[PDB]
Amino acid sequence: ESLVCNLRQLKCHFTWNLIAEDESLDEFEDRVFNKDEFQNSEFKATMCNILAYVKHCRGLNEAALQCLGEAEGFIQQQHPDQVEIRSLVTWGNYAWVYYHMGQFSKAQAYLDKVKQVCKKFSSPYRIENPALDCEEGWARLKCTKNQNERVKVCFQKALEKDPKNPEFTSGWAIANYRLDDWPARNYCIDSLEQAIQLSPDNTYVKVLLALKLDAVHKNQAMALVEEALKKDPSAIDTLLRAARFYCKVYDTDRAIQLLRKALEKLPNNAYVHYYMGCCYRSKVHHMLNRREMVFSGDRKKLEELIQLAVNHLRKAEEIKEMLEYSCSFLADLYIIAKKYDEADYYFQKELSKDLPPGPKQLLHLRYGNFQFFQMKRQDKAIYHYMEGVKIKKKTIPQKKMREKLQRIALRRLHEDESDSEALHILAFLQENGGGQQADK
């Protein structure tokens, strides 16, 4: 039908292909809403549109209509002068949702409204078509020096519009190679300063400028945080970001009060419990290195630390084992606490979960060190180091693990239990030697 042919040409959230390579809609909604619960939005219409799209993908349409109505209300509330231009995407969302439901008359009417606005505001000479988006980009490859970021976007647009085309694919591959070889260097200090000076009362970029940079500012950097809290006390943005910043300050009495205020807002959240666990952990590890003296408060601090960590773990992690990566902190917490049986329980809970090869070999290295320190036996430790070296990822923990294998070669001289496994160790090390003289 001609209706879908016309609908394909609109630009809106449905066409932009927001979700991709996400195993479920639950992961998408969690990562967009709960995880970065802070950001919210500078332009209130984006959140309602995203929520409406997710609601439609769930199977409910009336909630989508309500959310889109709220989005239009916010658009009218904010910008009265440009109400015609800013309302263009929401009309496309109405058209798509109504077409999905079946009321074709409303979809046709909204299509006519969009056409009228476009015809009134369009330019007679410009045109959009991926052929030009490819010519622009073959110009850039030859003319550019070190900024290859817009080349890749220009080629992605054309590739997305029409895939399996040799020319677009070659351009995209070349851009990716150039970006991989020499990464783009970016600095937020000047942009953040300009953003603050142009538009005050933002009370967010202030906090970002404080935590990210201006370490030399010290108390002057803290002044930004105080002014940000003073200007907008009801902003969850500044609240959460200031509380995390105080962890670097090592002033929990202040950070925890802010986090309790935040918990008064959103009780069901789990990351609120996570941050409190990070706050006790950073302070107790800092005071463990050299404070010494009475060393009494630390046992209590560890007690509330572990209780908040468990209160975190009971939610949002039993459903998905991978998320929050907390089990390593739980394990090391028990190791400091000198209690070992729940320590091995929780570490074994961590180990059963799949991880990327880098984190996997890091886990093998850490538990090799553990299996060495707390257990008399050595065979388990050499086995776990063998497990780690079986992974072929190239990274600096892997180099430290080669150093561990050299140590085990020494332990062959020291302990007789090493036996032929040390022979396999030296075989692997001479293979690595052949490789490194091959690199020459």
Binding site: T46, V89, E128, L132, S170, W172, D180, A195
Partner: protein, 382 residues
């Protein structure tokens, strides 16, 4: 009224190709290196860009000739998409005539571009700064920071100062530096090589990737294949010589560059590369206590003849704003090799010259007024 129409077109004159403020050795030789190794579609694109470079250099009449050749190739082929690609060429006529003063002629092409754009119009979408910010916010929340950076950046070009776009761009920059964006290289290069089976330039790019990843047997096998099939292509030879330099073999790297230098007539950019490599190998042999060798002499003599040939080549060249700008860049390198090769081995022959005249030319380059005018238009800092 014609002044307002021009900025709305899409052509090389509205893209900010030289935004960085940094330019390479003059592109005349780089843009049109080899023309017998390309197809019709790539030939048309090269001529479109070659006109823009020439026009900035002052040769307006030659610029029209470059555009005409690309016009013929696109007209010869009959296809729907070929008509749309023609819109870029017609944008260059309007800008060149208007600058050249033939205002009546430029009105004809502005008329012609309108009918073509009218037939292929899209009646359901438009482009404006307000539509780039709304897309920028959505891409920010979904976690695609790199794509959100460029939606805000392109919107600031239209409006130089805007309190809303400026705030958004800083947030995307902060998120990127916290966690870099992933890049896929070996997957994309392998996929592209399967669609294009007769391209050898993509072969040496993958091999250079594999060498750094830790595998040389895979890398070296790929390069030996590429050199055999196309042994007279400048692009492959430079990349192959780079691979051996990274591997540790400088003798073979020298031989490949020497082959590449004798490939085309546009060998000016390659002079700087070869000159540096001889200096590196000669300095190494000092460390090996090899102060005198038939082999050490076998290198010093070659550097002697190249220095004279490059210096002779520079003097016999037409004076242009772009030639002067590129000459100043190569001056520090050619000077350093001068005292190393000839002033030490033997007293310089006075009557042979090629010096104190080349140096005299350098002083005249700085005083040129035409270079000063060009840098102001391109906004290149001094």
């Amino acid at each position: 009224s014609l002044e307002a129409i021009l900025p709305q077109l899409k052509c090389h004159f509205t893209w900010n190709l030289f935004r960085e403020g940094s330019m390479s050795s003059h592109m005349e030789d780089r843009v049109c290196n080899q023309v017998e190794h390309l197809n019709s579609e790539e030939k048309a694109t090269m001529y479109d860009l070659l006109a823009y470079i020439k026009h900035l250099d002052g040769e307006s009449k030659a610029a029209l000739e470059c555009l005409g050749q690309a016009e013929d190739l696109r007209k010869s082929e009959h296809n729907d998409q070929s008509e749309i690609r023609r819109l870029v060429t017609w944008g260059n006529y309007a800008w060149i005539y208007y600058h050249m003063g033939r205002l009546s002629e430029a009105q004809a092409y502005v008329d012609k571009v309108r009918q073509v754009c009218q037939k292929f119009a899209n009646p359901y979408s438009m482009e404006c700064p307000e539509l780039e910010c709304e897309e920028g916010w959505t891409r920010l929340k979904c976690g695609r920071n790199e794509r959100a950076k460029m939606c805000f950046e392109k919107a600031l070009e239209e409006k130089p100062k805007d309190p809303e776009c400026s705030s958004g761009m800083a947030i995307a920059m902060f998120r990127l530096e916290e966690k870099p964006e992933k890049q896929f290289s070996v997957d994309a290069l392998k996929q592209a090589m399967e669609l294009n089976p007769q391209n050898q330039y993509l072969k040496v790019l993958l091999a250079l990737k594999l060498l750094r990843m830790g595998e040389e047997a895979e890398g070296e096998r790929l390069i030996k294949d590429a050199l055999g099939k196309a042994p007279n292509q400048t692009d492959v030879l430079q990349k192959a010589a780079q691979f051996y330099k990274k591997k540790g073999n400088l003798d073979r790297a020298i031989e490949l560059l020497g082959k590449a230098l004798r490939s085309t007539v546009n060998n000016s950019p390659l002079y700087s590369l070869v000159m540096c490599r001889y200096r590196e190998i000669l300095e190494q042999l000092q460390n090996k206590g090899d102060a005198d060798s038939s082999e050490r002499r076998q290198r010093m003599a070659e550097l002697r003849r190249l220095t004279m040939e490059f210096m002779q080549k520079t003097l016999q060249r037409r004076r242009s704003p772009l030639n002067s700008y590129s000459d100043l860049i190569d001056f520090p390198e050619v000077e350093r090799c001068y005292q190393m090769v000839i002033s030490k081995e033997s007293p310089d022959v006075e009557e042979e010259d090629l010096y104190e005249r080349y140096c005299n030319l350098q002083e005249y380059h700085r005083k040129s007024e035409d270079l000063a005018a060009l840098e102001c238009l391109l906004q290149f800092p001094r």
